[PDB]
Coordinates of C-alpha atoms and ligand atoms in Angstrom, one line a residue:
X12 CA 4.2 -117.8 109.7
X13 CA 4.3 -118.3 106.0
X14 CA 2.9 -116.2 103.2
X15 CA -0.2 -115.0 103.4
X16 CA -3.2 -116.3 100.7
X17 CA -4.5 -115.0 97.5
X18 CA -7.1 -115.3 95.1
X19 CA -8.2 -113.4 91.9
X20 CA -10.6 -110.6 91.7
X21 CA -11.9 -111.9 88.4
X22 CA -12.8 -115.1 87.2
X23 CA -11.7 -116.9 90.2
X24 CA -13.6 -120.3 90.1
X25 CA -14.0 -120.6 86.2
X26 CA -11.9 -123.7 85.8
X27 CA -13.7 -125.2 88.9
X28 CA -17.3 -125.0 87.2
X29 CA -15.7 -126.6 84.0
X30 CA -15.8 -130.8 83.4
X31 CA -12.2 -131.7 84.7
X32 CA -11.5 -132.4 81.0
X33 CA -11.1 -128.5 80.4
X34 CA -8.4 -128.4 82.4
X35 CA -7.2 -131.5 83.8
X36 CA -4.5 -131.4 80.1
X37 CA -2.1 -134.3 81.4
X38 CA -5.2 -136.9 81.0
X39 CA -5.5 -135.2 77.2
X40 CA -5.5 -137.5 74.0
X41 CA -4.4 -135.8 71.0
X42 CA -4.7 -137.5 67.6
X43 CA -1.6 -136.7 66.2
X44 CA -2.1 -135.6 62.6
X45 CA 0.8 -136.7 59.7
X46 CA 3.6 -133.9 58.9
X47 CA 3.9 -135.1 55.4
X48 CA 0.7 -133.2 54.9
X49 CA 3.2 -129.8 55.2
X50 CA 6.0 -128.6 53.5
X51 CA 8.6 -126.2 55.4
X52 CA 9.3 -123.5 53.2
X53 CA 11.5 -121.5 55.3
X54 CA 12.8 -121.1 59.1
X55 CA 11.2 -117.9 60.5
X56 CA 13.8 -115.4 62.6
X57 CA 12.3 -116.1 66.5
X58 CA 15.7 -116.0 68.2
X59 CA 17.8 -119.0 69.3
X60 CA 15.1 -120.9 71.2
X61 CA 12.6 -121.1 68.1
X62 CA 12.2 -123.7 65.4
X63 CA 9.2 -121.7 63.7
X64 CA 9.0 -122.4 60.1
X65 CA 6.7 -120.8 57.3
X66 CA 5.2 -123.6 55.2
X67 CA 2.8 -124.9 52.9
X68 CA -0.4 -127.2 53.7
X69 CA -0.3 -129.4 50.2
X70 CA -3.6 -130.9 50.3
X71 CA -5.3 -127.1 49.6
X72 CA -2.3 -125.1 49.0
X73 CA -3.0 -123.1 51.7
X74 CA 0.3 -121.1 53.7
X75 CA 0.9 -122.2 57.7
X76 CA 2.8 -121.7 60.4
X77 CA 5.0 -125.0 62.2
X78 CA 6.1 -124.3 65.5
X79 CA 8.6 -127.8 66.0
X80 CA 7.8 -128.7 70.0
X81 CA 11.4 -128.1 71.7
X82 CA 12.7 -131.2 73.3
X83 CA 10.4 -130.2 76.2
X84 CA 8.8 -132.4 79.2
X85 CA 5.7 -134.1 77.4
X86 CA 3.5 -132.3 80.2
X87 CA 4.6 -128.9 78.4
X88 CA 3.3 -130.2 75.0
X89 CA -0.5 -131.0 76.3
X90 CA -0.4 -127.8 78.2
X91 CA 0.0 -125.5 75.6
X92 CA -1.9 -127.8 73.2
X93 CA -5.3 -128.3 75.4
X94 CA -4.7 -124.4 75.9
X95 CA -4.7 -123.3 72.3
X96 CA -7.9 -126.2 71.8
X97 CA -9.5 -124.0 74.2
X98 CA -9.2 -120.4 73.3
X99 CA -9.2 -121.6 69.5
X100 CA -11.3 -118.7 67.9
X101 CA -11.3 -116.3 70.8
X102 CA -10.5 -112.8 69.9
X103 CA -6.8 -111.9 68.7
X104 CA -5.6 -115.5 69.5
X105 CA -3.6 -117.4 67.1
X106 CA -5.9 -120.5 66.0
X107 CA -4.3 -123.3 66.1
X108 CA -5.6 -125.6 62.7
X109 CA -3.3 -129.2 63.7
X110 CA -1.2 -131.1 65.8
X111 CA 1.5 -133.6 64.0
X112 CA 4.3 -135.9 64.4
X113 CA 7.5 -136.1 61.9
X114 CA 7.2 -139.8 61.4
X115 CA 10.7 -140.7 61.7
X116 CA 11.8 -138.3 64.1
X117 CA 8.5 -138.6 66.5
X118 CA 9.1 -134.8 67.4
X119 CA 5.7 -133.4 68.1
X120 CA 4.5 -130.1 66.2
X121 CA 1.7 -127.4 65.9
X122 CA 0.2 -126.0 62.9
X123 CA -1.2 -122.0 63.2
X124 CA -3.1 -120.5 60.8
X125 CA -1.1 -118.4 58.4
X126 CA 0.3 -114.9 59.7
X127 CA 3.5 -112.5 58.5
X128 CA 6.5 -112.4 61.0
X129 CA 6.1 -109.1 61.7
X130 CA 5.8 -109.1 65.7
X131 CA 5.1 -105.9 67.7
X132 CA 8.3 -105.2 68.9
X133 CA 9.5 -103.7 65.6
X134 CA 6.7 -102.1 65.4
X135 CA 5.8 -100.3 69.0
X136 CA 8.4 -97.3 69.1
X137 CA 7.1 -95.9 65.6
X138 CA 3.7 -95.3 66.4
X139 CA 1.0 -92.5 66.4
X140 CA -0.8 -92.5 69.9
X141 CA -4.0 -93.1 68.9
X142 CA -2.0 -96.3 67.2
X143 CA -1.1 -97.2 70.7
X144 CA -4.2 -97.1 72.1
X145 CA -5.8 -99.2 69.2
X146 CA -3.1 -101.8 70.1
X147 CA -3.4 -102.0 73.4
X148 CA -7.0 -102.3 72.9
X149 CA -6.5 -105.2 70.6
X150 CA -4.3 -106.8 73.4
X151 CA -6.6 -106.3 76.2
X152 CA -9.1 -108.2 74.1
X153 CA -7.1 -111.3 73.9
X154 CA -6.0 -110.9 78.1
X155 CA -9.8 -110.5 78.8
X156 CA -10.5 -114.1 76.8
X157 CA -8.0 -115.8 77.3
X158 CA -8.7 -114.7 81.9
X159 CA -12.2 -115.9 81.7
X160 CA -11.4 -118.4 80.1
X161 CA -9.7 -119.8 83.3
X162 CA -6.0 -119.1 81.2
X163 CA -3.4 -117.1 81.9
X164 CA -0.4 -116.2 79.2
X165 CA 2.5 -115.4 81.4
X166 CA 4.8 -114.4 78.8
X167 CA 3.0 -111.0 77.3
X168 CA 5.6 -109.1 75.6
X169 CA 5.9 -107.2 71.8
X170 CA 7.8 -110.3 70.8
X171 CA 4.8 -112.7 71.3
X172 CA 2.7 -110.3 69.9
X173 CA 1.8 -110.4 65.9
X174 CA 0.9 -107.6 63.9
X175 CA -0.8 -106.9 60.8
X176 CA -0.2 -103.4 60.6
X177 CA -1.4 -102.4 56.8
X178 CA -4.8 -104.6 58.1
X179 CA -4.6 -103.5 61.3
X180 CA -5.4 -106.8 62.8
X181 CA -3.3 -108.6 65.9
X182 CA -2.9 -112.1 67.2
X183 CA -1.1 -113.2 70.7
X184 CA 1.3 -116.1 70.2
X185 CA 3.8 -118.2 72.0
X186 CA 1.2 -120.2 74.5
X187 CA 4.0 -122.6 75.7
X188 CA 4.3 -120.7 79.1
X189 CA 0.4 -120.2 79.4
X190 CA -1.5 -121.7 82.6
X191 CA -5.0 -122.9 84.1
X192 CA -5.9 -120.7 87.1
X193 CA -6.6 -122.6 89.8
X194 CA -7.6 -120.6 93.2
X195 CA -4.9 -121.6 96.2
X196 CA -2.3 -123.0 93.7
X197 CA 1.2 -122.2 94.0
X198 CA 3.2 -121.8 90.7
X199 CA 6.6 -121.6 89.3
X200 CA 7.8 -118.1 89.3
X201 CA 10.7 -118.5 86.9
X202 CA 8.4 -117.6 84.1
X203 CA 8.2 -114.6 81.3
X204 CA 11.2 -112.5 79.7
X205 CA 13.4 -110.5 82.8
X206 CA 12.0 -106.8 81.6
X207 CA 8.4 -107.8 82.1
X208 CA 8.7 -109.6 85.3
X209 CA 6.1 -108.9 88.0
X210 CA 7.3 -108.1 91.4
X211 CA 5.9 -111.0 92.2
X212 CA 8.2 -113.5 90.7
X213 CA 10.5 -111.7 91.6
X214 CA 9.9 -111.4 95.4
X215 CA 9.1 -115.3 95.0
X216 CA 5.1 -115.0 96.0
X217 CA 4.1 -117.7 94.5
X218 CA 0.1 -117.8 94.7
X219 CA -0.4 -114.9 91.8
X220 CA -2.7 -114.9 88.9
X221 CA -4.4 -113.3 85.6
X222 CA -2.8 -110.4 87.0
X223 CA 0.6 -110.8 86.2
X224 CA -0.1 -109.9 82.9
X225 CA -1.4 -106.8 83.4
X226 CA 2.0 -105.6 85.0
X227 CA 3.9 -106.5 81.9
X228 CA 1.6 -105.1 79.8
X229 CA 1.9 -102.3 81.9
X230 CA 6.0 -102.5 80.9
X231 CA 4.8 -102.5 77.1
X232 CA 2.9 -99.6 77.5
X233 CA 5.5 -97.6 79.4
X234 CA 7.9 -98.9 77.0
X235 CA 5.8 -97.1 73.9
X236 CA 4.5 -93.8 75.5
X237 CA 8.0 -93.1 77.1
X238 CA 9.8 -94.7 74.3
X239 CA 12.3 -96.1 76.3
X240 CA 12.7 -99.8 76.0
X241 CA 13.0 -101.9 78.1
X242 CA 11.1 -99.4 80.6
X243 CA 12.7 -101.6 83.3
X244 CA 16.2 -102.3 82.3
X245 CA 17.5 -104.6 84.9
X246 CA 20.7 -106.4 84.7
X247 CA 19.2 -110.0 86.6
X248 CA 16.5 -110.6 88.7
X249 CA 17.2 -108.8 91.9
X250 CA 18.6 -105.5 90.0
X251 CA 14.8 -105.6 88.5
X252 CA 13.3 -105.1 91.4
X253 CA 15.9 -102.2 92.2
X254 CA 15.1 -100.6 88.6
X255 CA 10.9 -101.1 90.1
X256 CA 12.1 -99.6 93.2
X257 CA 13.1 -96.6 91.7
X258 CA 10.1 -95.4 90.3
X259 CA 7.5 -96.8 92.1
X260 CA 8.9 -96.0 95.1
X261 CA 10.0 -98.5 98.5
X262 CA 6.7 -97.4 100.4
X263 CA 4.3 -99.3 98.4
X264 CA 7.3 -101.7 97.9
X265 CA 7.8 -102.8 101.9
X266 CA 3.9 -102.4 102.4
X267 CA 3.5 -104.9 99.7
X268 CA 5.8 -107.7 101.7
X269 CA 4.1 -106.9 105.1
X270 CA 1.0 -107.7 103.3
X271 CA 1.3 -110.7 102.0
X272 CA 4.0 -111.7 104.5
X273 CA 6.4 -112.4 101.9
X274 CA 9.7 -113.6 103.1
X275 CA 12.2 -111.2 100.9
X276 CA 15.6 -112.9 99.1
X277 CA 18.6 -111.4 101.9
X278 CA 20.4 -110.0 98.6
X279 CA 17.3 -107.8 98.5
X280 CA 18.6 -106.1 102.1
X281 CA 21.4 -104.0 100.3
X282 CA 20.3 -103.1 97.0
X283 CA 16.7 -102.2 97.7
X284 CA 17.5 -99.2 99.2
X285 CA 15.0 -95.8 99.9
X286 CA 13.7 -94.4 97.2
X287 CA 10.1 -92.0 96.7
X288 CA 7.6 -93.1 94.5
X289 CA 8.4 -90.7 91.2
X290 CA 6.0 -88.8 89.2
X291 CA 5.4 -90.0 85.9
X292 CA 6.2 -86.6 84.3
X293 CA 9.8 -87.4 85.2
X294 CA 9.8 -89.6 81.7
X295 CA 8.2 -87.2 79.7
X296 CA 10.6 -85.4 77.1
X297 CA 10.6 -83.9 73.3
X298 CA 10.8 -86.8 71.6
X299 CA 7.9 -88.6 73.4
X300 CA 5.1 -85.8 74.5
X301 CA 2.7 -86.6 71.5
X302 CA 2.3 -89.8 73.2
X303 CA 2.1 -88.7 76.5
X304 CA -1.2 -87.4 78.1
X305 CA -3.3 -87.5 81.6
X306 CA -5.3 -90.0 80.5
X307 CA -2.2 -92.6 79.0
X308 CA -0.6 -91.8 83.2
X309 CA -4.0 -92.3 85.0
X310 CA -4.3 -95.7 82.9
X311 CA -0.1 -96.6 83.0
X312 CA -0.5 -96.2 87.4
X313 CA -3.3 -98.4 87.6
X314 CA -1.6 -101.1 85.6
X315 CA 2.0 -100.8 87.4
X316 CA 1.3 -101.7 91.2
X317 CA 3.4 -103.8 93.3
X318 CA -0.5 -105.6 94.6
X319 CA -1.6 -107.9 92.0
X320 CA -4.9 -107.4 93.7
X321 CA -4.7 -103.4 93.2
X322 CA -3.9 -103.5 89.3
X323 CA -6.8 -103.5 87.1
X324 CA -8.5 -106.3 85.3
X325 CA -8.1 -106.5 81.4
X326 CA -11.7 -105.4 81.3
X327 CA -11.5 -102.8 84.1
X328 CA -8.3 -101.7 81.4
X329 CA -10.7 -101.8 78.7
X330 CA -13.2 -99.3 80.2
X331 CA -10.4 -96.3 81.2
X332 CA -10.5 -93.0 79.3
X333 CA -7.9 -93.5 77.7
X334 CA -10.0 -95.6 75.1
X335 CA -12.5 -93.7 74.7
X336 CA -12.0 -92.8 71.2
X337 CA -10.7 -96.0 70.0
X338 CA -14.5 -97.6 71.4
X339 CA -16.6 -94.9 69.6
X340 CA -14.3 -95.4 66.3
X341 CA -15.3 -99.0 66.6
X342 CA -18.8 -98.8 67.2
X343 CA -18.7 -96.6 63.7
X344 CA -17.3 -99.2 62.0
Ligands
7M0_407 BR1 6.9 -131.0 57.0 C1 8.1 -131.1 58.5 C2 9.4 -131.6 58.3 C3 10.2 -131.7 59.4 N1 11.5 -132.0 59.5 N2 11.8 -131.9 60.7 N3 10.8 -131.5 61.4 C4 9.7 -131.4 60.6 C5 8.5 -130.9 60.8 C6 7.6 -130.8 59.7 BR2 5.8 -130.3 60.0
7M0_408 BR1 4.7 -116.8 64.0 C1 4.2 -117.9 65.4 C2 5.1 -118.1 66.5 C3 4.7 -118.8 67.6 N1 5.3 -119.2 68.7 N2 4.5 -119.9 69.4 N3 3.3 -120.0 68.8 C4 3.4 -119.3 67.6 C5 2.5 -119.1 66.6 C6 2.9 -118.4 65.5 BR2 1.7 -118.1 64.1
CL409 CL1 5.4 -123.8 84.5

C-alpha cells in the first residue's frame, strides 16, 4: 500500500516525556534583545546565502558572532532559536549568548559566542589520521547531544563545522535546518547540501530520523580517509543516488525499497542500473594509505548503509575501535 513505518533505535520518545514547551517552538516567546548593543565589524565569507558578521558586544567589549535571520518564514526563526536555547552548553555546540532586532529594520538576529571562521572544510584534506579520528570524535559528541536531546541537525557537513585547530577545540554551527524528533512524523526531504544526502531523501522516505546524520557524516569521513571530496560527486539528486549505487552496490539498494515499500522516482528506472557492492580497498592509493586502516573501513561500512535503521548510533560510533586511542589519550588528559 504505502510506505512502510519507522521509528528510531535511540532516543525515540524523548521529546514525548518533555513539557510541550521543549518542543512545541511555534508557541515560543522570545524577548528580543536591542542590536544597538553590537557593533558589526566585518561580514564573514559563508558563501551567497550567509549574512554572518564578526562584531563587537559594547557593553563588555567582548568579540561575537551575528548571524542576520534570512527573510525566512517566522516558523524557521523559533525553530532554530528554541533549538539552540536547548542544546545551549551541550558539548561542541555553538552557544548561542542573544537574540535581537535591528530597530528600524525589524530583521530578527542571533548572537554566538565568539569563534575564528576557520570551518573544517579547509581544514579536513590536510590532516594526520590520528587528527581525523580526534575530529570525528569531537563531532560524534555534539550528534550524540544534540540525538538525545530529541534534535536532529540535518545539515552535517565540514562547512557547518568550526575548528580551532591550534586549540584543538570544535563547535557545530548552522542550526537553521535542525529538527525535533517526533516518532511517526513525516518530514521534508529537501534538506542538507546534495553530496551528503542520505538515500533517504533521495528515494523520498519521508519518516527518517537522528540517523540521517550519521550517513553524511559517513560522506565526511570517506571524504578525509580517501581524500577525495565530495566522496559522492553527483551532478543532481537522482545522479546521487547512481554515484551511491556504484559503491554500495544495487543489492542492498532494491532490498532497501522492498523494505520499507518505498515507491522509487520512474527517472530512477534507467539510471540505477546493476552494479556490486565494491570493496573499500578500491579507494585506497599512495597518496591516502596513512589514513587508511581496517579499523577506519570496519567503522566507514557501518556508517554508509542504505537502512537508517542498520547504521550506527553516534554513540554506537563512539565505542568502535577505531577510537580507541583517541579515548585512552583523553582519559590521560
Ligand atoms: Br549592530 C547590527 C546592525 C545591523 N544593520 N543591519 N542589520 C544589523 C544587525 C545588527 Br546586530
Ligand atoms: Br561563524 C557561525 C556561523 C553560523 N551559521 N549559523 N550559525 C552560526 C554560528 C556561527 Br558562530
Ligand atoms: Cl523543514
Amino acid at each position: 500500500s504505502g510506505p512502510v513505518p519507522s521509528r528510531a533505535r535511540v532516543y525515540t520518545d524523548v521529546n514525548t516525556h518533555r513539557p510541550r514547551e521543549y518542543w512545541d517552538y511555534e508557541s515560543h516567546v522570545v524577548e528580543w534583545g536591542n542590536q544597538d548593543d553590537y557593533q558589526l565589524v566585518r561580514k564573514l565569507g559563508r558563501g551567497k546565502y550567509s549574512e554572518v558578521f564578526e562584531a563587537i558586544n559594547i557593553t563588555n567589549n567582548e568579540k561575537v558572532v551575528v548571524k542576520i535571520l534570512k527573510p525566512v518564514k517566522k516558523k524557521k526563526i523559533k525553530r532554530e532559536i528554541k533549538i539552540l536555547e536547548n542544546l545551549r552548553g551541550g558539548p561542541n555546540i555553538i552557544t548561542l549568548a542573544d537574540i535581537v532586532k535591528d530597530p528600524v529594520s525589524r530583521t530578527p538576529a542571533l548572537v554566538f559566542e565568539h569563534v575564528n571562521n576557520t570551518d573544517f572544510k579547509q581544514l579536513y584534506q590536510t590532516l594526520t589520521d590520528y587528527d581525523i579520528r580526534f575530529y570525528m570524535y569531537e563531532i560524534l559528541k555534539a550528534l550524540d547531544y544534540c540525538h538525545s536531546m530529541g534534535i536532529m541537525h540535518r545539515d552535517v557537513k565540514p562547512h557547518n563545522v568550526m575548528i580551532d585547530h591550534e586549540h584543538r577545540k570544535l563547535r557545530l554551527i548552522d542550526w537553521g535546518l535542525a529538527e525535533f524528533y517526533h516518532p511517526g512524523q513525516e518530514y521534508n526531504v529537501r534538506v542538507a547540501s546534495r553530496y551528503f544526502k542520505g538515500p533517504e531523501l533521495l528515494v523520498d522516505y519521508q519518516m527518517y530520523d537522528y540517523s540521517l546524520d550519521m550517513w553524511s557524516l559517513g560522506c565526511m569521513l570517506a571524504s578525509m580517509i580517501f581524500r577525495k571530496e565530495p566522496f559522492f560527486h553527483g551532478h543532481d539528486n537522482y545522479d546521487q543516488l547512481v554515484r551511491i549505487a556504484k559503491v554500495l552496490g544495487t543489492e542492498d539498494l532494491y532490498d532497501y525499497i522492498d523494505k520499507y515499500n518505498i515507491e522509487l522516482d520512474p527517472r530512477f528506472n534507467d539510471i540505477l542500473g546493476r552494479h556490486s557492492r565494491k570493496r573499500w580497498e578500491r579507494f585506497v592509493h599512495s597518496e591516502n594509505q596513512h589514513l587508511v586502516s581496517p579499523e577506519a573501513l570496519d567503522f566507514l561500512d557501518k556508517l554508509l548503509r542504505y537502512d537508517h535503521q542498520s547504521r550506527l548510533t553516534a554513540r554506537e560510533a563512539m565505542e568502535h575501535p577505531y577510537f580507541y586511542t583517541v579515548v585512552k589519550d583523553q582519559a590521560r588528559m
